[PDB]
Every structure is written in structure tokens, then in C-alpha cells.
Amino acid sequence: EPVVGTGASLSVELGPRLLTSIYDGIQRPLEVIREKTGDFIARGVTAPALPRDKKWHFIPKAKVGDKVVGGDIIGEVPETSIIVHKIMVPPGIEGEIVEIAEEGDYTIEEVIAKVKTPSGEIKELKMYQRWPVRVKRPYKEKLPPEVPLITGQRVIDTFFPQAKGGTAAIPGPFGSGKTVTQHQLAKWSDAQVVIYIGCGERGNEMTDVLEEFPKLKDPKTGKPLMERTVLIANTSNMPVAAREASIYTGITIAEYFRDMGYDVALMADSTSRWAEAEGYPAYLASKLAEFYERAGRVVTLGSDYRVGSVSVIGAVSPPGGDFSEPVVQNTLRVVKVFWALDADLARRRHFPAINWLTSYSLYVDAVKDWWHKNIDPEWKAMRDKAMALLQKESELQEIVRIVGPDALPERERAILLVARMLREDYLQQDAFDEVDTYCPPEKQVTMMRVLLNFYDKTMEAINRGVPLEEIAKLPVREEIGRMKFERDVSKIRSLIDKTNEQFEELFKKYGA
């Protein structure tokens, strides 16, 4: 109960009823009290993490005489209408199943299986397990980044992708009302389970968490989002030790769902705060690295080949306006993706307000082959080409700030026209629209083809004396501006041929 080292069993419970729960930094339900210290040990107070009274349906998935290892799945429990809970042998336990519960209803303290280890010790297995939050749950192998976390947000999926098992940062307050991508990511990413550490601490970012989240829908199923979510609260009311520990608790819970074969998204909030008071400054930064090192897509423990994932999205909010010290410089050395939410884009109402010049993803090469093989062989070429055009536009805009626009040749005016179309018809996305709130991979590449083909044809036309003013008012342009609102991808695809012919009608009219 007490003991020396790093804590004496600072841990979490894992079994049916993690989903829909609201918790604190150390897994106590709807607001409890005070913990102290760390670096050595810690003290606690009363609350039961998972209900012992509630009865769960257990479907056995193994028989007497089955050999099992850590992570093997011995049964299933239908926990919400979205998520089947997978009952696994805890890590470090192996042997022969000598006893196993029949199908039926059971509380979580009941013994649903027994394992005889090779030395003969009999281990009793319940529907839940405990794990020290500060030790990475083990796995067979950490796979290299390969499969994108598909977000359905064009700028992210196309230009700044996150891999499943990857690490990403975004400017913080998740509760910030100036942006909604943080909410788009939670509901649309193709993770089955979300672990959310909303440490919104005061007023308008705290009671909006309670009794809206229960009404929030999971757009994929119609059912509520909380049926595939675990909330971890981090209020100003709470002790600084439980706040600190909350991310370790969240990522341990994420890892546990990963181990079942789920893709999970862990979203960690953060606030403009005074975190102050081992060779320090550098040490905390080294420990943060370790937290982010727990993200990954893995072959999980178990006898079946099984893959699961934890992807991390961390909020970042410096004390001041400037993104220099505390959290931001230290976070940006470890994360492979930064989505630079930009107050000046927001005021211009360019939405998602993601600065396409200051954001970055180091996963582009990691994920390209998944796109090429599954969606479009030209994904990476198109993406690179569109970015180069965005870079060119920005270089041109700088020059035109100095000398103005009147001296622009047709060619540069043309680059400006097409870059503007890319920004308006592709980067900008309407999270409030029934269609455009999510953009499937197949739609993203077709929209990109339409735009780049219009670019090719624009430059071909300039190259042949067609005035730009004639191209600017080509009727298909306005259809290109509305294609994000079209569900039918084949109708978007048809814009390619329509662009081609309209341009032919222009080559003709000029003898070009």
C-alpha cells in the first residue's frame, strides 16, 4: 500500500464503464479532493473508479484448455451501443485457462476466468485490471508511421497529415470560441475511441463541458459522442498534483483501448498558466518527451496478430501572446505535426484558420503510400504542386506590398488567381455545413485534380495569348467554388471535362 521508489502503486482501473465517465487527474468520478507531493509518493481520498454494482453482459471467447498470453482476448462485453469492450488477459500473465464463466451477467469484481501458469500458480481474472499510470503498457512492436489518421479536414489531411500513432500540437484553449477544428478532430477522426483531457479551468470553459457533451452527437452513428469517449477534467478547483498526473492517466487509458485493437485519439488540453517549482528546466522537458513517446501504432500483446493505435493531439498555450518559452518550444521539439491556428486568418474569416506557411507535418512521406495505393496514385505530386503554388503566391504578395499590382504580367496574375481558388475552394472548409463538415479522401483528391487541372489549363491559355480576364470569368470557375458543397464525387469529377471544353471554346475564339 505504501512503499519506496516512484509512488507505491499510483494506478488506474480498466474495464467496462470507462466509457461515458468523467474523471479527475487520478480517476475519481465527478469532482473529489486533494493529493500532494510526487517525485517520491502520494496520498489520496475516497471514490470508486468503476461501479461494482452494475451488471455487464459477458460473452466468453475462449474455452477450458486454451493456452493464453498477456493481451489475449478471453471475452467481449457490449459496453455502449458503439463500443464492444474486449476482455484481455493482463500483461505478465500466461498459461492454460482452467476455468471460464459462461455467458451471462456479472459485476466487475466477479471472477470470470482462471489461468494456471506454467509453474502451476492459479491466477484469477476479472473484467477489469489495474495498471500503474507511470509505466507504458507493453506491446510487441511499435510500427513506423504509415497510415494517416483521417480527419476529413482538407488542409490537415492534404498538407499537414497526422499518422495513426502520431503526435500533433495545436494552439490551446480547446474551449476557445475563435476556432472549431479542435471539435472537428474529436468527432471526425477515424479513431474508434477518444480520450479527452479538457483542462478548461474557469467559467465559460467548464460548465459547457457538463450537459452539452451528453447531447453531442457522434456524426458517424447518430448516437452520443460520450458513448466512445472518456472525459478527464482538469479544473482550477483541483490540486496541482492530480492535474499533472491527468495526462499519464489519460494515456494509460488510451493504451488500454489500443491493446484491444482500437485506434484511439488522445486530446490533451492546456491553459495559460503558472507552472513553476533532478537538474531542472531541462528535466520536465525530458519527461514531456517521454509522455509523447507513449504515442504510437503497435502490434499489441496477444496470440493473434493485432494492431491498435494511440494518436496524440496536444493543445499549446503560452503564458503571453508569444509562442516562446514554457510549453511551446518544448512541445514543438517532440511533436511531428503543428497546426498553426492563426488569429489573423480567423479575423479574415478564412476557416479552418490554419496558417499554411507556418504549419508542418513530418508525416507526409510516411503516409503517402497509403494514399497512392488506396485513394489516388498522384496524391503527393498534387499536394506538393499545390503547396508550391501557395509558396509562390506568398512571395508574390510580399513583392506586391512593396511595388503594388499594376506591373504584374498576365502569368503572375494567373498564379494569383489560381492560388486564390486553392485558398477559397480547397483550404477553406465549412464545418457548419451538412456536406462540407467532412470531406472523404476520395473527394479531397478529386477536388484537388479539378483545381490543378484548371491551373494547367490556365497557364496553357496564358501561354497562347488568351487574356486572363477571359479565364477569370470562365463559367466553370463558380462551379469549382461550390464543389465542396457537392456530395456526389462523380459530379465533381465531371468538372475536369467541363473545364477542358470551356477552355477549348476559348482557344477557338482566339485562334489560339
Interface contacts to ligand ADP, rule CB under 6 A: 171, 176, 178-181, 184, 341-343, 345-346, 351-353, 429-432
Length of the chain: 512
Min separation Cβ 254 and ligand ADP, Å: 24
Closer residue to ligand ADP (CB): 41 or 180: 180
Q: Return all residues near 314 (Cβ < 8 A) that are at least 6 apart.
A: 167, 168, 169, 170, 268, 270, 292, 331, 335
Min separation Cβ 315 and ligand ADP, Å: 10
Q: Give CB contacts under 8 A, 24+ apart, made by 206-213.
A: 206/175, 206/235, 208/175, 209/233, 210/22
Q: Assign 3-class secondary structure to 268-289.
A: ECCCCCCCCCCCCCHHHHHHHH
Cell 491556428: give the residue.
341
Min separation Cβ 288 and ligand ADP, Å: 21
Closer residue to ligand ADP (CB): 174 or 257: 174
Task: Specify whether the backbone of 202 is left (phi greater than 0), alpha (psi in -120 to 50) or beta.
Answer: beta
Min separation Cβ 383 and ligand ADP, Å: 19
Min separation Cβ 147 and ligand ADP, Å: 24
Min separation Cβ 255 and ligand ADP, Å: 29
Min separation Cβ 427 and ligand ADP, Å: 10
Closer residue to ligand ADP (CB): 311 or 428: 428
CA diameter of the chain: 91
Closer residue to ligand ADP (CB): 67 or 487: 487
Closer residue to ligand ADP (CB): 130 or 348: 348
The DSSP annotation for 430-487 comes to -TTSTTTT---HHHHHHHHHHHHHHHHHHHHHHTTT--HHHHTT-THHHHHHHGGG-S
Q: Are 96 and 66 in contact (CB under 8 A)?
A: yes
Q: Are 23 and 249 in contact (CB under 8 A)?
A: yes
Closest CA to 251 of 133, 111, 96, 426: 133
Closer residue to ligand ADP (CB): 167 or 317: 317
Min separation Cβ 226 and ligand ADP, Å: 22
Closer residue to ligand ADP (CB): 152 or 302: 152
Q: Calculate helix-pair angle for 282-292, 240-259, nearest 10 degrees.
A: 30
Closer residue to ligand ADP (CB): 72 or 342: 342
Min separation Cβ 485 and ligand ADP, Å: 12
Closer residue to ligand ADP (CB): 433 or 501: 433
From residue 216, alpha-carbon distances to 147, 219, 222, 229, 315 in Å are 28, 9, 9, 11, 21
471/220 Cα distance (integer angstroms):
40
